[PDB]
Structures are given as structure tokens and as C-alpha cells.
Design a protein around this ligand. Sequence first.
Ligand SMILES: CC1=C(/C=C/C(C)=C/C=C/C(C)=C\C=C\C=C(C)\C=C\C=C(C)\C=C\C2=C(C)CCCC2(C)C)C(C)(C)CCC1
Ligand SMILES: CC1=C(/C=C/C(C)=C\C=C\C(C)=C\C=C\C=C(C)\C=C/C=C(C)/C=C/C2=C(C)CCCC2(C)C)C(C)(C)CCC1
Ligand code: SF4
Ligand code: SF4
Ligand code: SF4
Lengths: 107, 91, 150, 80, 61, 728, 141, 39
Amino acid sequence: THIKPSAQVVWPIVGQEILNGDVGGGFQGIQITSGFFQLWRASGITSELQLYTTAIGGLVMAAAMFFAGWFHYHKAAPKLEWFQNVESMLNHHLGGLLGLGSLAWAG
Amino acid sequence: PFIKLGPLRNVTAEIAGSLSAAGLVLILALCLSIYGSAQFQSTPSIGVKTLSGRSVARDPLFSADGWSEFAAGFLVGGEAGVAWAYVCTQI
Amino acid sequence: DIAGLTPCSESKAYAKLEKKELKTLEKRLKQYEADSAPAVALKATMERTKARFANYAKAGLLCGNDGLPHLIADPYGHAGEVFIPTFGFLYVAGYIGYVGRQYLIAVKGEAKPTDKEIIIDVPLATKLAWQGAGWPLAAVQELQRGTLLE
Amino acid sequence: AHIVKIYDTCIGCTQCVRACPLDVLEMVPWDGCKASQMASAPRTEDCVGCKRCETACPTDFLSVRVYLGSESTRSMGLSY
Amino acid sequence: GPKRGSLVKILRPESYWFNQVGKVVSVDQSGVRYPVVVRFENQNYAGVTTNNYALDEVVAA
Amino acid sequence: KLFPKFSQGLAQDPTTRRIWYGLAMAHDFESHDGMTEENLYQKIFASHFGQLSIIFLWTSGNLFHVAWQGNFEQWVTDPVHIRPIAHAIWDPHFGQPAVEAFTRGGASGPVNISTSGVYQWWYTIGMRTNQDLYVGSVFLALVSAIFLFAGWLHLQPNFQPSLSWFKDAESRLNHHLSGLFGVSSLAWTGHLVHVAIPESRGQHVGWDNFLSVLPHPQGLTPFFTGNWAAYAQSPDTASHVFGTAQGSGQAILTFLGGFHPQTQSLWLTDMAHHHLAIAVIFIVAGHMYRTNFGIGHRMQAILEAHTPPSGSLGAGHKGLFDTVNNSLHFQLGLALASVGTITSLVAQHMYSLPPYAFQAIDFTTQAALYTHHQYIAGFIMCGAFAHGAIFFIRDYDPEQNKGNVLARMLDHKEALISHLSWVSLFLGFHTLGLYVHNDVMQAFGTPEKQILIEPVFAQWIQAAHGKALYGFDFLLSSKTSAAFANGQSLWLPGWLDAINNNQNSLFLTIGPGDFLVHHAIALGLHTTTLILVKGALDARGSKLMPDKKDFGYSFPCDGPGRGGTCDISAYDAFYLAVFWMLNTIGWVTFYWHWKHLTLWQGNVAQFDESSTYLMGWLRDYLWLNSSQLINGYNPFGMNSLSVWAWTFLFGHLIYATGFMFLISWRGYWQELIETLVWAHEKTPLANLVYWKDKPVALSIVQARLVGLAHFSVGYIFTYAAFLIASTS
Amino acid sequence: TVPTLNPDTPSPIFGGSTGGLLRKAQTEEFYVITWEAKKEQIFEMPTGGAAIMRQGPNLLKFGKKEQCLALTTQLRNKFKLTPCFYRVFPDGKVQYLHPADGVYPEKVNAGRVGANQNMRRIGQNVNPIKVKFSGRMMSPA
Amino acid sequence: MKDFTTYLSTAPVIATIWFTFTAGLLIEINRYFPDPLVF
Ligand SMILES: CC1=C(/C=C/C(C)=C/C=C/C(C)=C\C=C\C=C(C)\C=C\C=C(C)\C=C\C2=C(C)CCCC2(C)C)C(C)(C)CCC1
Ligand SMILES: CC1=C(/C=C/C(C)=C\C=C\C(C)=C\C=C\C=C(C)\C=C/C=C(C)/C=C/C2=C(C)CCCC2(C)C)C(C)(C)CCC1
Ligand code: SF4
Ligand code: SF4
Ligand code: SF4
């Protein structure tokens, strides 16, 4: 109720220091309006360590996606036939992605 | 229209609405007499035939003596026709 | 003094602009302990902000009825405000410009020059970079010599 | 209608005839140029003035010019 | 006409390369008016690197 | 065969365009069918009369309604605390409380407050009753009818003048300089001496008795004697009350300087001597060109003689006589240039040296006027530069001007254009750079870090003029300067007293906020001149389009080919130039408005401190002084500032339509229409109606004008509503 | 050589579109296109829509000559065919247009003398003071 | 890597490797010499 959500700090140079405003909890900074703090409460996040670990995971996933993109063009590029399997694409996206997604989330 | 929505809707409400309907009549008559003043200089111009395709006589809808009697019809019809929406709703 | 405006070293309003800004930050600093992180920032800013005012009073700028330092732009009380800096620019701008001149001309004679505007010959540019240090001595000599104009 | 003229700098590369959407220009024999041919504008009453002809000309400066003039039903691209 | 590949200034005022330099590709030996075919390094607005000129609209310099 | 009577080409147009162009083509004489130089000049002459008749009728109209509907007589008796009535209003659309609201002054119904300064004008000149206004209204109406008469008069073959007569420039110059300038200012001075001065001294002199009243006790004795000093023997006292006997003197011609202390306007004795003095210079100077007597100068010979040695100016001015005497657009360019300068001249001298009693006490009137003449001056300037290139295209003879100043002008035009570009980019970068710098320092709470340059150069000039604030001690500041000692016993006491009264507008105090804005205005000037000059010089030919002069002054483009050629014509150059006009005089008028608003309000420290950054303009000028304006109505109730706020929004709405016509162009709209014209033709009942004139989209050039027009109107009206509502 | 006769032949298959004829065809000049399509293959309607061509002689009806020369260039480039086309007037007269002299305008055909052909460089035009006091323009000299 | 270095010597890359330099330089100098209106 009595802390303003903040997740950005300015460096002390060139008067920009003033942007670090009175946001609460003994911390000086920019009040965020992205709504992450509430996501985090909804996900059950309790400590920062957890946020760190989630962050490192996202970086690995970024590496994996970049790898994936080089791979599926430079080593193993799928054939026209492939991309045209619309029925299979639709089924897998509906049931795996959305379905198992919200299922495991619900977990 | 000009009875229930007008400025004197909250009161001369139908006397107010009466001759105002008699007006767009007389302006249409200017619009239709002035519409006619420009167009017709020499003879008519319509799709002459019917759906059957035989050369039927051309209509006087489009002519020099045509739109005059329409413009007259729009006046005598309008002015008189206005009076009977306030001989029935008022008188 | 010049245009009747007071010197910042003396003027009241300027010295009351000191007070207001400092006494804005000391109304914040109350809401934190002395050992804390943001207290070291609201002390350091103050120290810097109070140092800043002191360093215009020592510089000796003219402050008006406003309380703000105004500037002098012609002759010698206030040379350093504009008259010195001014040369600073015309140098470094002349530096940049003449390096850029010596690059484009140095490429010009090489079959397709347009490639060197994009895939820039870095080790050409970085040699012209240093050469462009002594540019007014070259710029003058080139105006003399008569290779400067088409 | 619009005015269209061809000047003597024409090479007769024929791009301006081939580009036109309303067939205004044609190629005629001549004695001036390496291609032995020159462009001509005998049908300017059908000219719309869209300036594809100009855009198509390779000569410097262009050897076709379209001067937008008095406008008639055809030149105004009307189908109504 | 000028010798092939010679550096020539244009003197036709309405040209995109006016008072500019070009190289002669081939001067047509016939009754043509603009025989001197010149090619330039830089294009005009109309994406063209080459044009035809008369003998009084060139000067080898 | 149909209207346009004057154009076969347009008359044969099957569409609605015929109409538009017809309206647009109406005043362009040279472009009409079967036109000659004779018809051109003659139509122009008649048209001038026509203009004059509209002007005199308009002026008479004002006087008429002030006399008939105003409170002219209540004003004279109490000028300080009565709001001058322009006109009555009879609006059947008004509601009950609206009629109460607009009943201001001593009016028996709804009325509007004049902000034209015609009251103080009149009043200062001598106008006293409604009767006077009526008689003047009749007179000037008579002059209007006379001018109309005159127009049709020299239309008949007996009274049709010859082209030779029109080309007699020397005679027109002599007559205008001696008669129109000299005699008419002499005669005014006559009016000031015989009517205005006595009226200020409280002796009402009318048609029936002037001849019987002595303006000076020993009148017309000094005049012939050469004892002119007697006319300056006893001026009005420093405690003189305007329009009353109290403190009045007898002098008719003085050099006093400063203001009439209670009214705060120039001394009518000074004005008299001024008009008289100039009158003499004009009268003597108007005998300078040769006509029918043998004595006088040749213009041609003067111009052709002025060619410097070693051809540093080429052939000098050889050939300019002909190219000017032939070219009408040249004359209109010179005329509009000069007229535009003097329009701003008027604006800048009138505010700082107001000439009218109990003006300058009228804030709203002053603001309205000064905005007025600066915008008028702007438009007039763009127009000058618009008949600039019309010359360059249609009129110029390249052979006849060979190697002159004009041809040489064309020669190095890339230098001119590129150096204007430099000068505008410089200002644009640095001024904006120093403002935005100033804002960032303001934002971070460190205004002490601002870059505030003090305007030392203007502060020097003000010092040379005698203001002592800055303490430079130069010329009219320093008591030990010949310049001081010469005129100290002439007018300087009235002058120096006025310059140093800082509650008046005369050479206001200047600080760093003044510094930035003047360089903003300089940006305004140089850039607009860049567009206009570039448009003028490249009207004839460029590298993209060498044959532009074959097309003329307005054309849409030259196609999409070889890159694209939108807004290529000098027309379009002037169009682009109008936007800078608007923006620049927008800046100048703001500058003006605020620096006064803060003076009247009693806190000049508001201006000096917030004008140094642009939020300051946004917050302290725009946001603050619209407070009352936007309140003219709310859900709770209404007040008297209804019309301005209505018109405020009106202007904004006009302003945004303009954007519509400027941004979106033809191809969309025509295809829109294309489907609509099918839609109509297969809609029954409506089928029975068909158009005579085929419906078509407005042209490019049409779109170009119509956008510009909406934009300008919206600009003007919006400001006007703001200016007036805030100042009032 | 002779211009085309103007006979009755059947137009190709089409469900109909709104893009087609209007009042202009009735009281002004509409346009007619003629060609011999070999097989039945589909074409783009220049006034919008899909339409199947028929074998033998096919004629279409348009109200502007662009709608012809958009189609003709679409019939000439794609299918490699060769169409003739001409005007119509509302009293029953015809104006034969294209190809005017059998040969298409791009490749040269004898008996087509040059019109609006200026015989100088454009910069060798006179200045527009030297064409006032007339009804003339800047190029025709 | 003749190819990789030509790319690193492309216009948009040089500009960025140049601007982070002349930006830092100006941020840096504003650190140890804070708040200048002279020199
Ligand atoms: C001192 C001062 C001042 C003043 C100033 C002035 C007054 C100036 C003037 C100036 C001028 C009057 C100038 C002129 C110029 C000219 C010219 C003519 C130029 C040229 C240039 C060039 C040629 C360049 C070149 C180059 C180089 C060198 C390098 C780079 C590149 C380039 C190429 C760009 C003030 C007060 C403000 C401030 C204080 C100080
Ligand atoms: C602006 C104004 C106005 C108007 C004005 C006017 C427009 C006027 C005109 C005019 C006038 C009002 C004039 C008057 C005149 C007078 C005179 C002119 C007289 C004279 C007399 C005498 C007696 C003289 C004689 C003589 C002698 C003795 C000698 C020499 C010769 C002579 C003959 C001169 C008004 C008010 C409305 C409004 C406001 C403002
Ligand atoms: S394009 Fe220019 S060159 Fe090729 S033909 Fe048409 S005119 Fe002759
Ligand atoms: S303008 Fe468009 S239409 Fe008129 S000729 Fe050149 S190309 Fe054919
Ligand atoms: S104006 Fe409209 S049409 Fe003329 S070029 Fe620019 S875009 Fe193409």
C-alpha cells in the first residue's frame, strides 16, 4: 500500500540524480508502471534470488533460440512440404503450446 | 419533426412546426426551378426502351416543359400538404 | 557592474538560491538514516550542489536581479565565459571538417570511391585523424598554395 | 487536351511509346539518329498527362515533354 | 571527333553533367547530329550513366 | 461560350474543376483570352478604383455603426472607465441569459467591445459627437460612389488612356511625391493645427466657424515674417488635461519629445511639426524627374550611369529601366516589399511611441493592433517574394539584361541560397540547443547552470539612446558628450524622461530571455527568406528541371520519374514559405504579448525568469492566460467570454481540417468519388436526378491552396481569440 | 492495309461486376476490344473481377481507352495474343483506333508523318516574354 | 577474418564504436570536472 514499485536506478552524474525519487522502502529510484511486481506476487515469488535465477534461465533460452535460428537455416532447413503441414501445426499448437502450457502453468 | 424537438417544444409549438415544414417545400421549389433553369435547352434524354427492349415513347420527366410542372407540383403539393399535418394534430 | 548586474560572489538572490536548493535536499534526507545508501547520495549531491555555487562565486560571473548567472560575449573581466571556448569549437569543428575533407579527397582517385564511404578504410582515416591535429597550419598553407577552391 | 512534343535529341529507343497507357506516341523513320527512327505524338486528344513517357526517356535532357494544357473528358481519365 | 576514351567537358547547359567530365565511348562516323557517345562515373536522377552529344557540345581537357 | 467568359480552355472543362479554376483565374489578366497590354493596364486601373471604393465604403461603415450603435459620447466624457462599443448585435439564436451577458457598457441590448483603437484615433484627431461620425460617414460614402463612377468613366473609348501614358513613370513619381505625399500631409498638418490642437485645448471648431476662429493669437505674421519661433512660444503644461482648457498652451509647432503625461501619447504640436516638416521635404523632392518642361532627371540615364570601374558589378544597372517599366510584377514586388517593411515599421514604432491619447492604457487594443500589422506585414512579404519569381519566369529578358546586377544575381545563386542555409542552420541548432539546454537544467533543479547570455549590444544601444539602467555612459547617457549638450535644451528632457519611465513600453528593459527569442525571430526571417529567394531564383531552371520557365509559376509536379518532383514549382515554394511566415510571426507576436502582459500585471520578473526556457512559455504564458478563456462556459454556468472561446475552438477545427487537405492527396479521394458516382447512377428515384457538372476531386494546386487557407485562417482566428480574451 | 470490320461476336464468360459501364456509355463514347483467343483461359478484369475467355472471336465493352490498353498489354504480354480495338458513339457510328496503321506504334511503319516534333534542343526555346500578346505557348516556335 | 573486419569497418558499426567513445569521453570529463559554465 505504502511503497511505490520501482526497478530502475539512475547513475549519479549530470543532475540525473534527481530522477531517483522518494519511492519507499529506503530506496531511491524510478517508479515502474509495467506491473511486474504484481506478476511476481501472483507467481509466488518471495525473494530476489529467485528473480536472478529466472533471469539467468531466460538468457540461456535466448542463446538456445539464437542457436535454433542459425541451425534451422544453416545446418537443417525444413522442406516446403514441411511448412505446409497445416493440420499438424494447428493440432500441435492448440494442444501442446496452449493446452499443455496452461496445464503446466495451472500446476 | 419541427413540433416536438424545436425551441418552443417546451411551451406556439405546432404553429412553430407548421410553416417550417411549408418552408423546405418552397426552397426545394427554388432548388428544383433552379435545377431546371440550367439543364434542359434542347429535347429529352432517357433510356428510351423497356426491359422488353422495344423503342417506347420518351418520358416528359426530363424536358423544358417537364420539370416546371414537377416544380409546381412540389409547391402546390408541399404548401397544401403541410397544412393537413396541423389541421389534424392541432385543429 | 557590466549592464549594472551584480557579481555572483556578492549577490543576495544567488546566495538565497544556494539556500533553497540545499534546504530542499535536507527536507528529503530526514526521511532516511545516516548509515543508509540514499543518505550518502542526498549528502553527496548537496556537497556537489553547494560546491557548484562556490565555484561560480570563485569564477566571478555576473548574477542579475533573477539570482542566475548571465554571460558576457564581446571583449576583459569575462574572457573565459565565451571568447576562449569559442576558439575551442572552431578548432575541433575545423579538425573534424578537415579530416573529413582529407578522407574524401584521399579516396576520390581509386576507381570506385563510393565503397570507401561505407566500408570505411579505418587505417587511412586513423592516420588522417592524427594529421588533422595541425589543421589550421595546413588549412592556411592550402588557402595560400591555391588547391583549396574549384 | 494536353500537349506532348518530341525534340530532336531522340535516340528512338522506343521506351516512351512502349510505356504509354493510352497510345499517344508512335515511331517514324528519320535521318538524324543512329537508330534511324524518331518519336511522334499524333494522338494528343487521348493524352492523359500521366508522364510515364517522360519517366521512360533515357536522353539528357528528356526528348519527350508533356505540357499539361486545357483539360477535356478523356484527359481527365473519366469513365462516368 | 574526339579520340576514344579521352576526358571531355560537357558544354550543353541543359545536361545533368554540365561543366562536368566524361569519357568518349565512340564518335559515330555518319550524318548523325549527336555522334559523341559519352559515359560518366556518376548517374543522373533518371538512372542513366551515358548520353549522346554534338561536336560543339564537347571540349577535350 | 460559357463562364469562364475569359477562357475557352477552362470553359470547355466538363467537370466541377471549370468552376473552381474560374474563381481562381478571375484576377489573372495576362492569362485571359485575347488579352493585350492595353486591356491589362486598363483593367488594373479600373480594379484599383474598385478597391478604393470598397475601402471607403468599409471605413464609412465603421463610423456609421459607432455613431448609430455605440457609446461614443459616453467615452469622451470618461475614456479611462468606459469600454468602447463597436456595434450592436441582433442574434435570434441567443438564449435568455446570453442577451443579459452581452449587454455591456450603457447599452440597451447586446454589444461588442471595440479593440481597433478607432475610438482613441478619432478622439485624438478631433471627433466629438455622433453628428461628426455621421457627416464623415456620408462624405466617405460619397467618395466611394465617386471612385466607382471614376472606374467606369475611364472605361469608355473617349476616356481610355494610352499605354504611353501608363509608362510615364517620372510624372507619376513627381506627382505622388509632391502631391499625394507632400500636399496631403501638409493639408493634414492643416487639420491638426485648425481642428485637432484646438480640440485638445477645449475649443470645438466646426465647418460653420473655423474660418472665424484664430488658432494662434498673432497668427500668420510669424509665417511670413520668418519669426517661426513664436509658434513654439508656450506649449501645453505638464499638468494639462486632454480636451480641457486646464493647463493648455498656445503653441502650434514644437519639438518637445516624450509624452503628454496624463494620456501618455505624443504631443500634437510635435505631430503637427512632423507632418509639416516631411511635407516640405516631399514637396521639394517631388520636382526631380523630367516631364514637359525640360528641367529634371532621366531615370534611364541615372541607372545606366551607375556601373562601377573594373566591372565589379558587371554592366551595373544597364537595361533595368526597360525590364522594370515593362514588368508589372517587378513593380508589385518592390511595392509589397517596401509596404511590408513599413507595416512592421508602423507596428514597432506605434507601440513604443503611441500617438493617440488614452491608447496604451487600452491593453487589448494595443495587443490586437500589434498582432494585426505584423501578420499583415508577413503575408505582404510572402506576396512580394511571390511576384519576385513571376517576374523571373514570365518577364525577364536574358539578352536585354546581359551581365547586369540581375543576371549576375542569377549567376551565383547557389552561393546565396547555400549561405542563407548556413545562417538558418546555425541559428536553428544553437538557439534550440540553448533553450533545450535551459529546460534540462530547469528540470533537474539547477537553473544556475543555465546558459543566459545578456544582450550587451541592445543594452548598449538603449544606453546610447539615454536609458541609464545599464550604466555604460554613452552618448545621450553621458552628461559630458556633445550629443547631449547640443539638444539638451530642445526635446531631450521630454525624451530621457520617457525612455526611463519603465511603466511605459519605450525601449523596454532587456535580459537573457530577450536574447534567445530575438535569435528565434532571426531564424524566422532567414529561413522564410531562404524558401522565398530559392523559389524566386530557381523559378526559371534547375538541374532537375532546366525548362521550368516553360511551365510557369504554379504546376503540380513533373511526374514521379527520375526520383519524383512534388512541390517543384515556385508556386509551391511560396506555399512552403507561408508556413514559416505563420510560425515566425507566431513567435514574434508571443514575444510581444507576454513581455507586455507581465509589465501590465506588475511583475516583469515573471517574464525575465520563465522566458529563458520553453516550458516557461508553455506553462507561464499559454497554460496561465487561457484559464479565463476556456472557462467562458462550463457545466455550471457562463460568462461574457463566450464568443472568444467559441471562436477559439472554431479556429482549432479550421486548423485541423487544413491538415486533412495538406496530408491526404488526390488519388484516394478521386477513387472515393469514383465509387460514389457509380453509387448514384444505380440508385433508383435518385436516378432521376443527374449532375450537369461531372463531380471530380480538387486539384493538387487546389488542395495546396485550400490547405494553406484553412491553416492560416485557423492560425489567425485562434490567436485573435486568445490575445483578446486573455488581455481583456 | 484495311482496318477491321465491326461484327457481332459473343463476349467471354463473366458473372458481372460494378466496375463496368454507366451513363457515359449511353450519352458519350464507350469503347470495344476485339481478338481471337485460341483456348479458354482466365484474365484479370481491369475494372475488377475474374473472367474466363472463350475460343474464337471475343469482344468486351469499356468506357475508357486505358481499360483497353491495360487489358491489351495484359493479353499481349501474358498469353502472347494480338487484339485490335476501336471506339463507339451513341448514334451508332465507330472510330477505328488500334493498331491505327495495322503496325503497333512501338516498331516503325511507313506512312505515319511526325506530329508535335520540335527540331531543336529544349534549352534553345525562347523566353516567355517573347510569347505574350497571343494565345501561344513556349515550345511551338 | 579479412571479411569479418571489413564488416566491423562498415559505416553503422564504426559510427557506434565512435559515438560510445566520444559520448564516454564527455560523460567522463563531466564526472571529474562536474558542472562547467566556464572552461
Ligand atoms: C570575434 C567575436 C565575435 C564576432 C565575430 C565576427 C564579427 C565574425 C565575422 C566573421 C566573418 C565575416 C567570417 C567570414 C568567413 C568567410 C569565408 C569565405 C569562410 C570560409 C570558410 C571555408 C573555406 C572553410 C573551409 C574548411 C576548413 C578550413 C576546415 C573544415 C572543412 C572546410 C572545407 C569547411 C562575437 C562578438 C560574435 C563573439 C566574441 C568574439
Ligand atoms: C480619416 C478620417 C476621416 C476622413 C477624412 C477625410 C477623408 C477628409 C477629407 C478632406 C477634407 C476634410 C478636406 C478639407 C479641405 C479644406 C480646404 C482645402 C480649405 C481651404 C480654404 C481656403 C479659404 C483656402 C484658400 C487658398 C488660399 C487662401 C491661398 C492658396 C490657394 C487656396 C485656394 C488653398 C473621418 C473623419 C471620416 C473618420 C475619422 C478619420
Ligand atoms: S523515349 Fe526519348 S528516346 Fe526513346 S523514343 Fe521516346 S523519345 Fe526517342
Ligand atoms: S503522358 Fe501519359 S499518356 Fe500522355 S503521352 Fe506521355 S504517356 Fe501517353
Ligand atoms: S505530386 Fe502527386 S503526382 Fe505529381 S509527383 Fe508528387 S506525387 Fe506523383
